[PDB]
Scaffold this active site. Structure first.
Site, PDB file in Angstrom:
ATOM      1  CG  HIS A 168      -5.856  -2.470  -2.547  1.00 13.84           C
ATOM      2  ND1 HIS A 168      -4.888  -3.093  -1.786  1.00 13.84           N
ATOM      3  CD2 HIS A 168      -5.588  -1.143  -2.485  1.00 13.84           C
ATOM      4  CE1 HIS A 168      -4.094  -2.178  -1.251  1.00 13.84           C
ATOM      5  NE2 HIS A 168      -4.506  -0.988  -1.652  1.00 13.84           N
ATOM      6  CD  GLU A 169      -6.523   1.240  -5.329  1.00 14.29           C
ATOM      7  OE1 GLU A 169      -5.430   0.657  -5.446  1.00 14.29           O
ATOM      8  OE2 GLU A 169      -6.694   2.204  -4.552  1.00 14.29           O
ATOM      9  CG  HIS A 179      -7.627   2.763  -0.273  1.00  9.19           C
ATOM     10  ND1 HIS A 179      -7.011   2.798   0.964  1.00  9.19           N
ATOM     11  CD2 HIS A 179      -6.708   2.256  -1.135  1.00  9.19           C
ATOM     12  CE1 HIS A 179      -5.790   2.296   0.853  1.00  9.19           C
ATOM     13  NE2 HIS A 179      -5.589   1.958  -0.406  1.00  9.19           N
ATOM     14  CB  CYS A 196      -0.873   0.004   1.247  1.00  6.95           C
ATOM     15  SG  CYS A 196      -2.317   1.082   1.170  1.00  6.95           S
TER      16      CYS A 196
END
Ligand SMILES: CCCC[C@H](CC(=O)NO)c1nc(Cc2ccc(C(=O)OC)cc2)no1
Ligand SMILES: [Zn+2]
Ligand SMILES: [Zn+2]
Ligand SMILES: [Zn+2]
Ligand SMILES: [Zn+2]
Ligand SMILES: [Zn+2]
Ligand SMILES: [Zn+2]
Ligand SMILES: [Zn+2]
Ligand SMILES: [Zn+2]
EC number: 3.5.1.88
Length: 203
Positions: free
Chosen positions: A173-174, A177, A130
């Site tokens: 993953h994004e 966020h 990350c």
């Protein structure tokens, strides 16, 4: 504000623009964008994609001091908006020939979300890193193997897309966020390398 600095015509995003683990913005639920997009939100999207392109370019990564990336979310720039950029390159063959398609996925996505997914889980064999995390973090980050996502592009057009493999992992993953979720939230607490039967380990 952060947004004002980032959208200046001559400003190139670099590591100094990326906030770090501990900054509260990484734990918020990011705000949905409204359409038509403001100029700032359109430009931010473009700057984010530019960052990814630069991070993958040997010269520009070196000039700007960039850690390589395949995804970036607005919260990592201290902007609490549902905007992500993803850029997943295909690889040359053993003969050095470029791939038919430069990228398996290239998009700036506004208000993306997972609308369905496989029962099967998957994880990258090598774990995840990350841009906001300056620590060694071992373990399988357990995600959905396959997902169906919806998102809007900068024009406001809606897209619906099924993803698998590395594309699926990157987008998840994004999206995490913009929901205030960090990759290590999804690593087993007791044994980072635990494998529940049926987990798809991606090499
Ligand atoms: C599996 C996606 C991981 C993406 C990260 C960059 C990042 O922090 N994106 O939000 C990164 N690590 C290696 N490449 O990119
Ligand atoms: Zn900067
Ligand atoms: Zn709202
Ligand atoms: Zn534009
Ligand atoms: Zn450039
Ligand atoms: Zn579900
Ligand atoms: Zn999910
Ligand atoms: Zn729908
Ligand atoms: Zn933990």
């Amino acid at each position: 504000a952060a947004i004002d600095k980032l959208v200046k015509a001559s400003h190139l995003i670099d590591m100094n623009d990326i906030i770090r683990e501990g900054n509260p913005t990484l734990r918020k639920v990011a705000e949905e964008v409204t359409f038509p997009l403001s100029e700032k939100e359109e430009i931010l999207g473009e700057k984010m994609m530019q960052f990814l392109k630069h991070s993958q370019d040997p010269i520009m990564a070196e000039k700007l001091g960039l850690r390589g990336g395949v995804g970036l979310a607005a919260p990592q720039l201290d902007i609490s908006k549902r905007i992500i950029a993803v850029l997943v390159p295909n690889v040359e063959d053993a003969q050095g020939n470029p791939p038919k398609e430069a990228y398996s996925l290239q998009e700036v996505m506004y208000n993306p979300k997972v609308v369905s997914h496989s029962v099967q889980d998957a994880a990258l064999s090598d774990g995840e890193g990350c841009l906001s995390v300056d620590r060694e973090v071992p373990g399988y980050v357990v995600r959905h193997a396959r997902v169906t996502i919806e998102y809007f592009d900068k024009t406001g057009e809606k897209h619906r897309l099924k993803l698998k493999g590395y594309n699926s992992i990157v987008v998840q993953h994004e999206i995490d966020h913009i929901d205030g979720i960090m990759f290590y939230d999804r690593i087993n607490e007791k044994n980072p390398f635990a494998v529940k039967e049926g987990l798809l380990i991606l090499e």
